[PDB]
């Protein structure tokens, strides 16, 4: 076979420059395999090309153990992930592998994580309300069915408890399947979410499940955290386009996708922006939020949660996501200390279905 | 990736005979801008010494590196 | 000919496969020209005796960070490779001696009886090998056990200003476990692991002397990491202390790590990265500032029944400046840990301790 | 004398500066054969390539390589002065870039270049480019031309845009 | 024949010396440079740029040095006079006398660059030191043999606080004193020597017990940064080789970190916070750990810090608060009301307040 074998020439942090041959170099957003000492592999996504038969790749795992001159084979396509009904109930990773110790994911097809969004002619507008069960959500800012929902809030206000309470009363009685893709979460939050869904009937190990689990907290490097949003959205997009089902994507948190790209932006040759951010903040956030919309084949109610930096809505990662969401549930730190459970702002929260 | 000093103009003078004028006290102005003047030469010139241009403007040699001042 | 010119000149041996020549060194950094077979984050040994860690691998040179003093390293020195990564000692024999950042004993008790060799940069536990925090960590304080009670496997932060009760809260929890560690119940005992990073020389000697007089230093690991050493030693104090405490949690015992402080570890990592020709981020820090503190705290989690049943408690102290918790290093550590203990400076001066 | 060939400006100025002084008294034909002997005795030789990537050298291993590749090689004019300027300025690692820029100046001012289809063209040294392209395309299409992509990709993109 | 070098570049205090031989000088090595003034020059090596060239830092003015001057190496660091011969004399940063009283007849000459004490040689205590002020004997009490910090802005009362404590504690302490002023004024150095001679502290015709070290702000950047290492070497020999309770008085301690930030941009280091050096915690920790109390003798450090434009959250003020037992912050708001001095009770804390 004609495998594009490359040689490692530079390795500083998550960025790793691979040198291949002339003409056989891989394209951007291409998965590069690397043989290590264990039974797994080292996935590396090609970001840019420095030239002279060399391209800078971003590793999706630990870069410790790589020497100058190791073999780096290219897969030919992007980061493939398992889609279909086989991903429901299993804990998938950023590269599409199982992390639940339940064997391999028997999938018939494998779609890539990097894909284009929908066009303007394929968009389908709607104005349907979605009942959540809370008294402050059903009267102030109502959630739209098939739209993007953003639960803005600071640290310790009630961002993780808001996404868990809504999934136990809306996702458990819905007709479609759920897609809990956590990016930039904690180690204890991943184990508590999987055990609660098994006792309620959302994830059955011996029966049928309707909730896709995608691992990827802050315990990995910067490459796995930035690619966790694209891997989790690829499984939910196949159920609404090929199967035609109302998928529900739960991202926790949505602010971890923008902060993961700025950690490796300084070593890739890019200048910093405002508040230590990357220059492609509006371009990277718009390419992933536009693909999780509602088209003519099916709907997709995204219930992501945005994390404000030390209670500040004027930041570059919080103000840029307010224009790509229908219902915004902004939380305040002053109402949580008085006894309001949860701290739902009755004046700062706005929605398009409040007419 | 390269270096300054000898570059294009300053790199075509050492291949023949860079003598004639005394380069220890005088020197050729290679660049000028932002209130500075990168003079090519000044080998025997001390630090913080007074200089003079061709038009009558005074100068003060601050840094004295190899090949430039 | 080409063979006749090399016989009258050229060079000598000195292979660049497992060795290398130091081309430039200074301010802790050391650019070694060579080391082709050297892996990333590997232990390097110089010709003078100072250890090194190759963290930046280029195509013509190799940036290695020295773990000691750079006064004996000059240009052209031989830098040999050990072949392994940055590891440290672990086991049950490390309890009772003040170790450093590389596992060497600094208390003067001879060698350390190590039962294994664990790496510093280890992976954290997954969601399948973790359970809920059900055990109870008795700290001894009446205001902490009734309000914000911590358990075995959780990460409780300790934010606050200087001279307010940051280091006093972590020292009281280690001495309160003497009633369960002196008996025979191994499930109720919790071994301490104090990692003094950024402290002075007089502060580390005063804390170790108070624990030995109250029968508490026999089952506690002391990680000596003063600010008078290199930047690579203080930055690697969090990864080296977590590897020694992870051996007890993977066997069937409980551990308690105390990263004092979290503010001193962030300044040591930004000093070594700025000298290795790297672009900075926010507040003159590195790009992966939030990823360095979140990876070391995610490994201290409570295991399940199939992994041994152990747990590891993390007590990271955050040194604030005037009560500002809305900073860059203050907001990053508060959104990764499962709770925080705010230590205000207004009620500490009136007498309400803590 | 500066010829209109551009050739970058910083990295390509090494061979352009030495070409002005070497173009006097007919000293341009001997510089082509002498520049090829310096790259062939440092690449595929595994003998004098012990200081190509190392930062040692320093007079001893820097002036001994310029004298051994000029006295016993094939140099007598100003060919030995090219290696001495790159040894003191730390530029001996890119010896292939200085030798490749010298052959492009003689082929541009005394011949054609560019390409056409399949492989290379003819690159004649007549005068104009229009009178030489029509007389060489008819003689090269008949003799040879095995013709073993561009036309098939343009036809498929036009049909998808109208559907 | 000693190691001779040649000057290749000179930009301010940084002077690049290119050695012709293969035996290059090490870090922190004193280099000589003859000119024509019966004084020559003192240059300290900082790092090595490679290619038989090392970047040195001169301790005086570099005006008049041409490209290609002779740079002789001394083979060791900047040595200074120690013992009982330095008491009563005004020494400089290179150990030379500036009091116009002949040379210092010392038996041994220790270097200014030395390692601090280890963890096994430390000795902690809790002895209170009575100063005489009502705001210091009740709020933040000072400790005997520790590090005292007198923080404050310009015009608050930093120089007046160190002068009042030395006239009521150091006059009846028994041991020798060490007044090493770094970054002081020109009139403060002459007024301190005349007041101590009329009270019995420094006797030119008798017995003295106070070491004076010159080094105001009128010198270059190399002499101000090396003024702290010259004064600390004389006080360390009286507590280790002789075993006496020395008293180190630095005024001010903030001039050591500010002098190194101006020369860090010409050495290749990138800027840190507020345009500071990247090795702020490494350089300040190496000098503060050596001025502590050991098993052979104690060392009461009574330094004073300067607030940068009345700001305690700076990189030179917040980094020095973790290496002092007692802190005395002087606020600028209380000095305008009539408080003599402006002792802030809500900011001054100590470890002996128990
Ligand atoms: N309905 C509620 N009633 C009482 N407390 C709540 C409620 N919802 C959330 N909380 C509190 O809010 C805290 C949120 O913690 P955490 O999830 O770590 O931070 P964040 O919510 O910012 O992600 C929890 O400790 C919980 O006690
Ligand atoms: N329960 C208590 N009672 C009395 N004093 C206390 C108590 N807890 C702490 N302290 C005092 O607080 C001080 C804390 O000092 P230190 O540990 O250096 O600062 P931090 O606590 O901010 O790390 C100690 O000197 C101690 O005297
Ligand atoms: N106890 C005091 N009573 C009255 N004035 C004082 C007292 N202590 C200090 N001062 C005033 O504070 C000023 C300090 O000046 P100076 O030493 O130049 O600045 P700094 O104290 O910031 O170094 C002096 O001019 C003095 O008049
Ligand atoms: Mg959360
Ligand atoms: Mg403390
Ligand atoms: Mg003063």
- DSSP letters, A151-216, are --B-TTSSSHHHHHHHHTTTSSS-SS-EEEE-SS--HHHHHHHHHHHHTTTSS-SSS---EEEE--
**Burial degree of E108 (CB within 10 A; 0-12, 13-18, 19+):** exposed
CA dihedral (C89, C90, C91, C96) in degrees, to 10, reads 80
**Burial degree of A48 (CB within 10 A; 0-12, 13-18, 19+):** middle
For β-strands C158-160 and C79-85, DSSP reports them as: unpaired
* Closest C-alpha to ligand 3, atom 1: E340
Q: Do D47 and C11 touch (CB under 8 A)?
A: no
Structure tokens belonging to residue E58: 């001169």
User: Which residues, at least 6 apart from C345, have a Cβ–Cβ distance to it below 8 Å?
Assistant: C160, C161, C163, C164, C323, E346
Distance between B58 CA and the closest CA of chain D, angstroms: 32
Please answer whether residues E341 and E330 qualify as being in contact, where contact means their C-beta atoms are separated by less than 8 angstroms: yes
Residue C105: count of CB within 10 angstroms of its CB: 18
Distances (CA, A) of C231 to A242, B53, C56, C234, C317: 55, 48, 15, 6, 20
Distances (CA, A) of A135 to A2, A142, A248, A329, C57: 61, 10, 22, 13, 57
CA atoms within 13 A on the CB side of A151: 23
At E247, give phi and psi (nearest 5°).
Answer: -130, 105
Determine the Cα–Cα distance for residues A151 and A329; give it in Å rounded to an integer.
Answer: 5
Structure tokens belonging to residue C69: 């003093």
Please answer whether residues C188 and C180 qualify as being in contact, where contact means their C-beta atoms are separated by less than 8 angstroms: yes
Determine the Cα–Cα distance for residues C144 and C157; give it in Å rounded to an integer.
Answer: 13
Which is the closest atom of ligand 1 to the Cα of A253? 23
Determine the Cα–Cα distance for residues C114 and C311; give it in Å rounded to an integer.
Answer: 21
Which of chain A's residues have a Cβ under 8 Å away from the Cβ of C298?
186-187, 217-219
For residue C260, the surrounding DSSP H or E stretch is strand C254-260
What radius of gyration do chain C's Cα atoms show? 22
Phi-psi region of A244 (alpha: psi -120 to 50; beta: other; left: phi over 0): left
Q: Which chains does B contact via 3+ CB–CB distances below 8 A? A: D, E
Strand partners, C34: C20
User: Which residues, at least 6 apart from E200, have a Cβ–Cβ distance to it below 8 Å?
Assistant: E171
* Closest C-alpha to ligand 2, atom 21: C165
Determine the Cα–Cα distance for residues A342 and A336; give it in Å rounded to an integer.
Answer: 7
For β-strands A143-144 and A44-48, DSSP reports them as: unpaired
Q: How far apart are the first and last CA of chain E?
A: 62
- List the alpha helices (DSSP H) in C8-116: none
Which residue in C173, C70, A265, A114 sits closest to E28, CA to CA? C70
Distances (CA, A) of A111 to A81, A182, E175: 6, 20, 80
Residue E237: count of CB within 10 angstroms of its CB: 20
Determine the Cα–Cα distance for residues B30 and B43; give it in Å rounded to an integer.
Answer: 15
Which of chain C's residues have a Cβ under 8 Å away from the Cβ of E303?
none
Residues for chain B: how many in total? 69
Determine the Cα–Cα distance for residues E41 and E31; give it in Å rounded to an integer.
Answer: 8
Could you tell me if E64 lies within 8 Å of chain B, comparing CB atoms?
yes
Which of chain C's residues have a Cβ under 8 Å away from the Cβ of A192?
132
Determine the Cα–Cα distance for residues E48 and E41; give it in Å rounded to an integer.
Answer: 20
User: Which residues, at least 6 apart from C104, have a Cβ–Cβ distance to it below 8 Å?
Assistant: C112
Determine the Cα–Cα distance for residues E150 and E320; give it in Å rounded to an integer.
Answer: 11
For β-strands C98-99 and C158-160, DSSP reports them as: unpaired
Q: Specify the 3-state DSSP secondary structure of D93.
A: coil
**Cis omega (within 30 of 0) on the bond before A253?**
yes
User: Which residues, at least 6 apart from D153, have a Cβ–Cβ distance to it below 8 Å?
Assistant: none
Q: How far apart are the first and last CA of chain A?
A: 61
| Helix axes of E280-288 and E227-240: crossing angle, nearest 10 degrees | 30
Q: Do D13 and B15 touch (CB under 8 A)?
A: no
Please answer whether residues C343 and C157 qualify as being in contact, where contact means their C-beta atoms are separated by less than 8 angstroms: no
**Cis omega (within 30 of 0) on the bond before C261?**
yes
Chain D residues within 8 angstroms (CB to CB) of chain B: 10-11, 13, 17-18, 20-21, 81, 85, 89-91
Q: Do B47 and E63 touch (CB under 8 A)?
A: yes
Determine the Cα–Cα distance for residues E281 and C261; give it in Å rounded to an integer.
Answer: 14
Distance E171 CA to ligand 2 centre (A): 32
Please answer whether residues A253 and A245 qualify as being in contact, where contact means their C-beta atoms are separated by less than 8 angstroms: no
Tell which residues of chain B come right before a gap with C–N over 2.5 A: none
Q: Do C201 and E52 touch (CB under 8 A)?
A: no
**Cis omega (within 30 of 0) on the bond before A179?**
no
Determine the Cα–Cα distance for residues E136 and E349; give it in Å rounded to an integer.
Answer: 10
**Cis omega (within 30 of 0) on the bond before E252?**
yes
Using alpha carbons only, give the angle E304, E306, E311 rounded to the nearest 5 degrees: 135
Structure tokens belonging to residue C343: 């230590």
Residue with tokens 């001994």: D64
Which residue in E333, E256, E325, E331 sits closest to E293, CA to CA? E325
User: Which residues, at least 6 apart from A342, have a Cβ–Cβ distance to it below 8 Å?
Assistant: A158, A161, A162, A331, A336
At E346, give phi and psi (nearest 5°).
Answer: -90, -5
3-state helix, strand, coil in chain A (%, to 5): 20, 25, 60
Q: Specify the 3-state DSSP secondary structure of A217.
A: coil
Which residue in A251, A184, A217 sits closest to C123, CA to CA? A217
Please answer whether residues A114 and A230 qualify as being in contact, where contact means their C-beta atoms are separated by less than 8 angstroms: yes
Please answer whether residues A9 and A68 qualify as being in contact, where contact means their C-beta atoms are separated by less than 8 angstroms: yes
Determine the Cα–Cα distance for residues A318 and A337; give it in Å rounded to an integer.
Answer: 23
Distance C150 CA to ligand 3 centre (A): 50
Determine the Cα–Cα distance for residues C73 and E167; give it in Å rounded to an integer.
Answer: 46
Could you tell me if A259 lies within 8 Å of chain C, comparing CB atoms?
yes
User: Which residues, at least 6 apart from E313, have a Cβ–Cβ distance to it below 8 Å?
Assistant: C321, C322, C324
Work out whether the CA dihedral D49, D50, D55, D57 comes out positive or negative. Answer: negative
- List the alpha helices (DSSP H) in A212-329: 222-226, 228-241, 256-263, 281-289
| Catalytic residue list of E | 158, 184-185
Structure tokens belonging to residue C120: 């510093």
Please answer whether residues C227 and E285 qualify as being in contact, where contact means their C-beta atoms are separated by less than 8 angstroms: yes
Experiment used for this model: cryo-EM
Distance between C205 CA and the closest CA of chain A, angstroms: 33
Determine the Cα–Cα distance for residues C288 and C282; give it in Å rounded to an integer.
Answer: 10
Residues for chain D: how many in total? 163
Please answer whether residues B36 and B29 qualify as being in contact, where contact means their C-beta atoms are separated by less than 8 angstroms: no
Residue E178, Cα to own-chain centre: how many angstroms? Answer: 10
Which of chain D's residues have a Cβ under 8 Å away from the Cβ of E51?
55, 58, 90
Q: Do D68 and C11 touch (CB under 8 A)?
A: no
Residue E144, Cα to own-chain centre: how many angstroms? Answer: 20
Please answer whether residues E283 and E264 qualify as being in contact, where contact means their C-beta atoms are separated by less than 8 angstroms: no
Determine the Cα–Cα distance for residues A194 and A89; give it in Å rounded to an integer.
Answer: 9
CA atoms within 13 A on the CB side of C260: 27
Please answer whether residues A21 and A54 qualify as being in contact, where contact means their C-beta atoms are separated by less than 8 angstroms: no
At C343, give phi and psi (nearest 5°).
Answer: -115, 95
Which residue in E150, C291, E25 sits closest to A219, CA to CA? C291
Catalytic, A41? Answer: no
Which chain D residue shows the shortest CA-CA distance from C14? D50
Distance between E41 CA and the closest CA of chain B, angstroms: 15
**Reduced 3-state DSSP string for chain E:** CCCEEEEEEEECCEEEEEECCCCCCCCCCEEECCCCCCCCCEEEEEEECCCCEEEEEECCCCCCCCCCCEEEECCCCCEEECCCCCCCCEECCCCCECCCCCCCCCCCEEECCCCCCCCCCECCCCCEECCCCCCCCCCCCEECCCEEEECECCCCCCHHHHHHHHCCCHHHCCCCEEEECCCECHHHHHHHHHHHHCCCCCCCCCCCCEEEECCECCCCHHHHHCHHHHHHHHHHHHHHCCCCCEEEEEECCCHHHHHHHHCCCCCCCCCCCCCCCCCHHHHHHHHHCCCCCECCCCEEEEEECCCCCCCCCCCCCCCCCCCCCEECCECCCCCCCCCCCCECCCCCCECCCC
User: Which residues, at least 6 apart from C147, have a Cβ–Cβ distance to it below 8 Å?
Assistant: none
Determine the Cα–Cα distance for residues C271 and E319; give it in Å rounded to an integer.
Answer: 14
Phi-psi region of A69 (alpha: psi -120 to 50; beta: other; left: phi over 0): left
Which residue in E238, E247, E120 sits closest to E178, CA to CA? E247
Please answer whether residues E303 and E248 qualify as being in contact, where contact means their C-beta atoms are separated by less than 8 angstroms: yes
Determine the Cα–Cα distance for residues B57 and A303; give it in Å rounded to an integer.
Answer: 70
Could you tell me if E333 lies within 8 Å of chain B, comparing CB atoms?
no
Determine the Cα–Cα distance for residues A82 and A97; give it in Å rounded to an integer.
Answer: 8
Structure tokens belonging to residue A75: 């897969």
Q: Do D55 and E51 touch (CB under 8 A)?
A: yes
Please answer whether residues A212 and A235 qualify as being in contact, where contact means their C-beta atoms are separated by less than 8 angstroms: yes
Which chain C residue shows the shortest CA-CA distance from D40? C2
Determine the Cα–Cα distance for residues E142 and E130; give it in Å rounded to an integer.
Answer: 7
Determine the Cα–Cα distance for residues D5 and D69; give it in Å rounded to an integer.
Answer: 29
Q: Specify the 3-state DSSP secondary structure of C203.
A: helix
Structure tokens belonging to residue E71: 């740079």
Determine the Cα–Cα distance for residues C338 and B55; give it in Å rounded to an integer.
Answer: 72
3-state helix, strand, coil in chain D (%, to 5): 45, 0, 55
* A347: DSSP letter: T
Please answer whether residues A298 and A245 qualify as being in contact, where contact means their C-beta atoms are separated by less than 8 angstroms: yes
Work out whether the CA dihedral C320, C322, C327, C331 comes out positive or negative. Answer: positive
Resolution in A: 7.9
Structure tokens belonging to residue C77: 């020195």
Please answer whether residues B12 and B32 qualify as being in contact, where contact means their C-beta atoms are separated by less than 8 angstroms: no
Structure tokens belonging to residue B57: 């403007």
Determine the Cα–Cα distance for residues A187 and B38; give it in Å rounded to an integer.
Answer: 58
Q: Do D17 and B8 touch (CB under 8 A)?
A: yes
Determine the Cα–Cα distance for residues E94 and E109; give it in Å rounded to an integer.
Answer: 11
Work out whether the CA dihedral D139, D145, D147, D148 comes out positive or negative. Answer: negative
- List the alpha helices (DSSP H) in chain C: 2-7, 142-145, 166-175, 178-181, 201-212, 231-235, 237-249, 262-274, 289-298, 328-334, 346-350
Distance between D161 CA and the closest CA of chain B, angstroms: 46
A185, A227, A237, A256: the active-site residue: A185
Which of chain B's residues have a Cβ under 8 Å away from the Cβ of E67?
43, 64, 66
For β-strands E177-180 and E142-143, DSSP reports them as: unpaired
Determine the Cα–Cα distance for residues E280 and E303; give it in Å rounded to an integer.
Answer: 18
Determine the Cα–Cα distance for residues C69 and C9; give it in Å rounded to an integer.
Answer: 35
What radius of gyration do chain B's Cα atoms show? 12
Work out whether the CA dihedral C152, C155, C160, C166 comes out positive or negative. Answer: positive
At D103, give phi and psi (nearest 5°).
Answer: -80, -15
Structure tokens belonging to residue E273: 């916070």
- List the alpha helices (DSSP H) in chain A: 160-167, 187-198, 222-226, 228-241, 256-263, 281-289, 333-336
For β-strands A211-214 and A178-181, DSSP reports them as: parallel
Determine the Cα–Cα distance for residues B64 and B61; give it in Å rounded to an integer.
Answer: 7
């Amino acid at each position: 076979a004609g495998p594009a074998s490359g040689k490692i020439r530079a390795v500083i942090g998550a960025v790793v420059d691979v040198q291949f041959e002339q003409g056989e170099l891989p394209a951007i957003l291409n998965a590069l395999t690397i043989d290590q000492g264990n039974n797994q592999k080292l996935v590396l996504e090609v970001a840019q090309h420095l030239g002279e038969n060399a391209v800078r790749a971003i590793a999706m795992d630990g870069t410790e153990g790589l020497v100058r001159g190791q073999t780096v084979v290219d897969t030919g396509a992007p980061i493939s992930v398992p889609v279909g009904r086989g991903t429901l109930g299993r804990i998938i990773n950023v590269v599409g592998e199982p992390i639940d110790e339940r064997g391999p994911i028997e999938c018939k097809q494998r779609n890539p994580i990097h894909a284009d969004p929908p066009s303007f002619v394929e968009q389908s507008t709607e104005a349907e309300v979605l009942e959540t069960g809370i008294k402050v959500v059903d009267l102030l800012a109502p959630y739209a069915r098939g739209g993007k929902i953003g639960l803005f809030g600071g640290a310790g206000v009630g961002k993780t408890v808001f996404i868990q309470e809504l999934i136990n009363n809306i996702a458990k009685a819905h007709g479609g399947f759920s897609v809990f893709t956590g990016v930039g979460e904690r180690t204890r939050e991943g184990n508590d979410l999987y055990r609660e869904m098994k006792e309620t009937g959302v994830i059955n190990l011996e029966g049928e499940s309707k909730v896709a689990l995608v691992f990827g907290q802050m315990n990995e490097p910067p490459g796995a955290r930035a690619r966790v949003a694209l891997t989790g959205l690829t499984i939910a997009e196949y159920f609404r386009d090929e199967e035609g089902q109302d998928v529900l994507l739960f991202v926790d948190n949505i602010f971890r996708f923008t902060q993961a790209g700025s950690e490796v932006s300084a070593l890739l040759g890019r200048i910093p922006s405002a508040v230590g951010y990357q220059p492609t903040l509006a371009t990277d956030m718009g390419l992933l939020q536009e693909r999780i919309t509602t088209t003519r084949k099916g709907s997709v109610t995204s219930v992501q949660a945005v994390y404000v930096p030390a209670d500040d809505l004027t930041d570059p990662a919080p103000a840029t996501t307010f224009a790509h969401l229908d219902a915004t549930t902004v939380l305040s730190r002053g109402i949580s200390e008085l006894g309001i459970y949860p701290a739902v702002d009755p004046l700062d929260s706005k929605s398009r279905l409040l007419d | 990736k390269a270096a300054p000093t000898e570059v294009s103009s300053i790199l075509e003078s050492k291949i023949r005979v860079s003598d004639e004028a005394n380069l220890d006290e005088t020197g050729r102005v290679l660049s000028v801008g932002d209130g500075i003047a990168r003079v090519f030469g000044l080998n025997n010139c001390q630090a913080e010494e007074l200089v003079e241009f061709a038009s009558g403007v005074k100068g003060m040699a601050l840094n004295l590196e190899p090949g430039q001042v | 000919s080409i063979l006749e010119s090399k016989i009258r000149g050229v060079s000598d041996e000195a292979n660049l496969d497992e060795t290398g020549r130091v081309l430039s060194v200074g301010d802790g950094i050391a650019r070694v020209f060579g080391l082709n077979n050297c892996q990333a984050e590997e232990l390097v040994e110089f010709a003078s005796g100072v250890k090194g860690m190759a963290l930046n691998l280029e195509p013509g040179q190799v940036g290695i960070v020295l773990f000691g003093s750079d006064r004996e390293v000059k240009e052209g020195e031989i830098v040999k490779r050990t072949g392994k990564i940055v590891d440290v000692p672990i086991g049950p024999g490390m309890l009772g001696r003040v170790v450093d950042a590389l596992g060497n004993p600094i208390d003067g008790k001879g060698p350390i009886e190590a039962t294994g060799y664990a790496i510093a940069q280890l992976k954290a536990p997954g969601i399948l090998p973790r359970r809920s925090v059900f055990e109870p960590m008795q700290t001894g304080l009446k205001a902490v056990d009734a309000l914000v009670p911590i358990g075995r496997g959780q990460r409780e932060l300790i934010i606050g200003d200087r001279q307010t009760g940051k280091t006093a809260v972590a020292l009281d929890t280690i001495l309160n476990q003497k009633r369960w560690n002196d008996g025979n119940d191994e499930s109720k005992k919790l071994y301490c692991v104090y990692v003094a990073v950024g402290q002075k020389r007089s502060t580390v000697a005063q804390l170790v002397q108070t624990l030995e007089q109250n029968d508490a230093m026999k089952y506690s690991i002391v990680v000596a990491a003063t600010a008078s050493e290199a930047a690579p030693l203080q930055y690697l104090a969090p990864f080296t202390a977590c590897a020694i405490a992870e051996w007890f949690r993977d066997n069937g015992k409980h551990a308690l790590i105390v990263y004092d402080d979290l503010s001193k570890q962030a300044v040591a990592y930004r000093q070594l990265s700025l000298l290795l020709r790297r672009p900075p981020g926010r507040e003159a820090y590195p790009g992966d500032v939030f990823y360095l503190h979140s990876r070391l705290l995610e490994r201290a989690a409570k295991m399940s029944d199939a992994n041994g049943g152990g747990s590891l408690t993390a007590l990271p102290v955050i040194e604030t400046q005037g009560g500002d918790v809305s900073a860059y290093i203050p907001t990053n550590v508060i959104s990764i840990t499962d709770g925080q203990i705010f230590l205000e400076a207004e009620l500490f001066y009136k007498g309400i301790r803590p | 004398i500066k010829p209109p060939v551009q050739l970058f400006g910083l990295d390509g100025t090494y061979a352009t500066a030495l070409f002005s002084a070497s173009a006097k008294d007919s000293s341009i034909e001997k510089t082509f054969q002498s520049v090829q002997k310096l790259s062939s005795t440092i690449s595929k030789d595994a003998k004098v390539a012990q200081v190509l990537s190392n930062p040692a050298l320093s007079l001893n291993s820097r002036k001994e390589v310029v004298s051994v590749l000029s006295k016993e090689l094939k140099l007598e004019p100003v060919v030995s002065n090219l290696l001495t300027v790159l040894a003191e300025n730390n530029r001996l690692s890119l010896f292939d870039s200085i030798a490749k820029q010298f052959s492009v100046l003689n082929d541009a001012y005394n011949g054609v270049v560019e390409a056409t289809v399949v492989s290379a063209k003819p690159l004649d040294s007549k005068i104009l480019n229009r009178l030489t392209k029509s007389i060489t395309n008819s003689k090269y299409v008949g003799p040879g031309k095995t013709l073993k992509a561009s036309k098939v990709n343009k036809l498929n993109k036009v049909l998808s845009e109208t559907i």
